[PDB]
Enzyme design. Structure first.
Site, PDB file in Angstrom:
ATOM      1  CD1 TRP D 218      36.084  44.789 -16.006  1.00 13.39           C
ATOM      2  CD2 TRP D 218      35.884  43.266 -17.634  1.00 13.39           C
ATOM      3  NE1 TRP D 218      34.823  44.909 -16.539  1.00 13.39           N
ATOM      4  CE2 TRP D 218      34.674  43.987 -17.539  1.00 13.39           C
ATOM      5  CE3 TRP D 218      35.997  42.250 -18.591  1.00 13.39           C
ATOM      6  CZ2 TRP D 218      33.579  43.726 -18.369  1.00 13.39           C
ATOM      7  CZ3 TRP D 218      34.906  41.987 -19.419  1.00 13.39           C
ATOM      8  CH2 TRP D 218      33.711  42.726 -19.298  1.00 13.39           C
ATOM      9  CE1 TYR D 222      29.230  40.994 -16.779  1.00 11.77           C
ATOM     10  CE2 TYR D 222      30.264  39.708 -18.518  1.00 11.77           C
ATOM     11  CZ  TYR D 222      29.161  40.377 -18.017  1.00 11.77           C
ATOM     12  OH  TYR D 222      27.996  40.431 -18.760  1.00 11.77           O
ATOM     13  CG  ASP D 238      32.572  48.242 -15.997  1.00  9.47           C
ATOM     14  OD1 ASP D 238      32.404  47.303 -16.812  1.00  9.47           O
ATOM     15  OD2 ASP D 238      31.918  49.309 -16.020  1.00  9.47           O
TER      16      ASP D 238
END
Lengths: 282, 282, 282, 282
Positions: D218, D222, D238
């Site tokens: 993640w 990001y 997410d």
DNA sequence: GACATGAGTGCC
DNA sequence: GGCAATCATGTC
DNA sequence: GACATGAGTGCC
DNA sequence: GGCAATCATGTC
């Protein structure tokens, strides 16, 4: 000629039978009363013949002239192959019912960890009989023929297989991957990277073994069991074993097998050779 | 009471003297007519007694009961220690002049690569008699005493040393770096990274060894010579060897030693035990 | 169109000369009043023109339409290439005499670190003139032609060089090892392993760069200087530098240059551009 | 003072709202009509102020006296933060229906990858407002206060965060593995292991990032999106994304998302900011 | 069977 | 929401 | 003797 | 230049 002892009982027919199924043409010869094969210790080569003597619980070993210089090593390799060290009272006492039908059972070893490593890899996916075929084909194209015993050929050495062309091995009846897995192993053998004798931490060593290409957990376990004669390893990924533990995931089987510590390897052999065995109705 | 062969000549006096000087108290007993030491093979252990029979070129090995289950390996271990495989008529035929004085010279092996590795390390910089006394302490502190023969004690095992407190090792009489080298070495032995038998590519294996903390080229070379019984290694970095080749650099010594390939190890022992030897005006 | 200023004095004469000597055909064009080259930022391509106006001590920057979307980055790139942040008063004041024959002296930066990385490797050994020609052939074979300016060609991207055929690059007149170095450098750039901006620890960063095949201490230093515009690095291995410090060895030259910290990069350029210069025999 | 262009439309209201909700006190200030924050480029420090001019389709940038020497890079930093390169016709011509509601959507970038990396980790498993306060503490505890603007403090440098008590960070309000994640990120930034600019192989670069402690798929996704401004990544792991695809698994989402290549980053943004959004039931 | 992908769980 | 430990798929 | 520095030399 | 091999030199 040379003689070694063993503690009764020893199921020689079961053992010879086991070796006979996997024997490699030109390399080994198996009969109901003896076992004989080519053998290379360094630059020394010849034929070894093991002749059991039941009444005497002794094993007579003869060596062709070429192996005499390293006689003792030949004997030690033979003792590892036949598990002469086993004390059935200890093991059978520990396994109880699981090994009561064949108390003479022994762990079939090997005479050379490198060879066993090659044997284990070619044992992947295919059948026992088929693997023996393939190995026989690899021995054929890469082994040295004994001058004094033309019928026999030495199992391919590390230096020879490390130089083999992946394509050639592929041509013999294996995926390119498998052939690469073999070449990598020969190199590890040349560098001293493939433990040739049982290591202190079999678990750690097996893990390291799994970083080798082509060597998964089944191969590493089976290799530790045969190549090292590791006495406490089970084969939860094994084909036949999945059949003996109906509908059980590998970790389940592994946990179940724990009750057999520290002789799991022996329990594995028993389950393999018990026709209708099935987990406890508990 | 087993028996192994050896080809003549064999200078037992020289061999026993070599082992005698490096004998580690409580582990080995060295007399001029016999060699004896505690011996551990896996869980099996006891005492080994080697008696040479000049009478008819034979070596009589006696095993206590606790080693009988693994008699074969025990004999293999002894054959490597006493270099029983050696064909002196082949070596001396190659070394010529250099070996004519002591044709019965043999390569003093070891009975276990790990032990030999520990000895190589504790042999760094100190005198022979010193390494011995120091090693005996290690054996005394981390060894498993035999019950069959209380007087004797087994050489430390890798798991025992791998778990040793560095400082505790230092207190025995060595720098910390050395105490650490031992610990690393044992770990390597535990996970199968320390080749226990001679590898196919000795040069390569020696290179890898040098990446071990506490192990430089002299140690690698020496380890290979005694731990693997590699027959073609020379020690150009050795203290005494440097004296034998006055004012020559390692490379020059090594270039010179090339004349004895493929038996540099034998050449090495002859030069080591030839006081006043000096190189030709080649 | 765009304009960026600088703090006097600025030796545009020198800056352009330096660049003109290393200009790559089809990639750059260096006149006495302006500098121009092809330029790619991601998928944005075009030509950049830089016209310096001494009078108003500002830099005129014109951008082809294709780069307009990433104008600012183009601007930041021209500012790194021309070292417009430099405060000559702070450097010339910390260097004394060394920086007097030309206080307008600037550190010739680069427009892309990967490109500078390639230039650094191809600049190994050969003359400045040959490096340029050699670099021209790499551009011609792997470069990207601008549809709007067929005379101009973009410097090869990592994607193209990482896929390049070793032998193809070799064929351009470079050793196989150099070609292999480029291919690896390209892969690192693709992977994000090549610092494209000055890292906090230039020393550590360079040390890591040296683990790259084909990149030694010289290439790393020169790369840091030009590619990251690291202001405090010296080239003690530089050939011309070796002649500027007759008789001294790398570390001695390196010990001497410490006097110029933390502006060793500038000192380097000055000593580089002063045929007379010679150290002060302490 | 300085002016940068952008192509309409540009939803400034949304952009500022996105940055305002994540605005770190003492670092940045956000208002209806402008953006302002501390900025450090080397030893140059000051305050940057961004004011959009809708009439001109322009962004006006103002730099405090201490950033003038590196004005262009400052400008380039603002351009990456406000995605001035974006051509909404291309992204919307591709996202079709999905972005028809807010054709002025832009990818909120960052002014420095390291900082963005720190913010990505500090925003793990917490609310936007908390990550903000949490980061704020970190900023005040290790930042560089501006002499000319006392209430503004520069984001912590990699050296400063590298040399930080792993407990002190914890104190501010984060787990232990959390603070170790930062300290590791900083070191990577010090040696050039953290890519500061978008790598040619975003996928591979992200894969490597996931090998960073505390940095999972993640954060790596990001981070690529904001720190590198990569335009074709998606965040199937997410929390909010999962809810926008009721039931579906990270691989299924990922596969449905492919319909938006090569602008998945944009697709993501539109989906995050479209409440009742749900995929075609088809 | 080895191996990469993907998907449970399930704990800090 | 990073991260270790399994299973279940699906080519090679 | 291990092991960092540092130089020389010689061959890519 | 890169780099592997080699030869002091100083330290522990």
């Amino acid at each position: 000629m040379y003689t070694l002892n063993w503690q009764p009982p020893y199921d020689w027919s079961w053992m010879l039978g086991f070796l006979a199924a996997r024997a490699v043409s030109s390399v080994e010869t198996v009969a109901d009363s003896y076992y004989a094969r080519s053998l290379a210790v360094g630059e020394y080569r010849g034929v070894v013949t093991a002749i059991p003597d039941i009444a005497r619980h002794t094993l007579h070993i003869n060596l062709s002239a070429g192996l005499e210089p390293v006689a003792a090593e030949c004997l030690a390799k033979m003792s590892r192959l036949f598990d002469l060290q086993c004390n059935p009272q200890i093991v059978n006492g520990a396994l109880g019912r699981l090994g009561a039908a064949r108390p003479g059972l022994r762990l079939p070893g090997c005479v050379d960890a490198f060879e066993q490593g090659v044997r284990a890899i070619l044992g992947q996916l295919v059948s026992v009989a088929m693997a023996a075929k393939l190995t026989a084909r690899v021995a054929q194209l890469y082994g040295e023929r004994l001058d004094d015993f033309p019928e026999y050929i030495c199992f391919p050495t590390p230096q020879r297989l490390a130089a083999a062309d992946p394509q050639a091995l592929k041509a013999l009846g294996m995926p390119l991957k498998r052939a690469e897995a073999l070449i990598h192993l020969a190199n590890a053998a040349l560098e001293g990277t493939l433990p040739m004798t049982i290591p202190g931490d079999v678990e750690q060593a097996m893990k390291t073994l799994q970083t080798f290409p082509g060597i998964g957990r089944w191969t590493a376990n089976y290799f530790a069991l045969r190549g090292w004669q590791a006495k406490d390893v089970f084969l939860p990924d094994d084909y036949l074993i999945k059949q003996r533990f109906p509908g059980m995931t590998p970790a389940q089987i592994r946990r179940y097998a724990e009750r057999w510590k520290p002789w799991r390897s022996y329990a594995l052999l028993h389950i393999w050779y018990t026709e209708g065995w099935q987990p406890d109705e508990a």
